[PDB]
Design a protein around this ligand. Structure first.
Ligand SMILES: [Zn+2]
Length: 119
């Protein structure tokens, strides 16, 4: 198969290393991530992979990864409105009476911010 489960991992750790040389920090303190509550991904599995590959780079080993549990949000296609998943039978858009809405937040993870220690 393919190591797609380590793509996100390798990417983030490389980004940490590339920021720390550019800011001339040569360390990290924290990283902060947002995992949507409908992505069904194990936060424990993702961090355990990040902590495993951490050893690739000396600046990376002094860090911790903080997972924010993120909410779900429903956007409308050709419209101008956004709401929370609640109704079903009458679960149409508030402006336009159709169920054409999509998940803009809740299915997908992203990085939120990073931190570095000067000392
Ligand atoms: Zn709409």
């Amino acid at each position: 198969g393919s190591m797609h489960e380590y793509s996100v991992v390798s990417s983030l750790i490389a980004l940490c290393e590339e920021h720390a040389k550019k800011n001339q920090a040569h360390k990290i303190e924290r990283v902060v991530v947002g995992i949507g509550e409908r992505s069904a991904m194990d936060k424990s599995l993702f961090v355990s992979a990040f902590e495993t590959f951490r050893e690739e780079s000396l600046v990376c080993k002094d860090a911790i990864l903080d997972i924010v549990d993120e909410k779900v949000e429903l956007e409308c296609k050709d419209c101008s409105h956004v709401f929370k998943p609640n109704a079903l039978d009458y679960g149409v858009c508030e402006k336009c009476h159709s169920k054409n809405v999509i998940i803009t937040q809740g299915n997908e993870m992203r990085l939120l911010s990073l931190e570095m220690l000067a000392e």
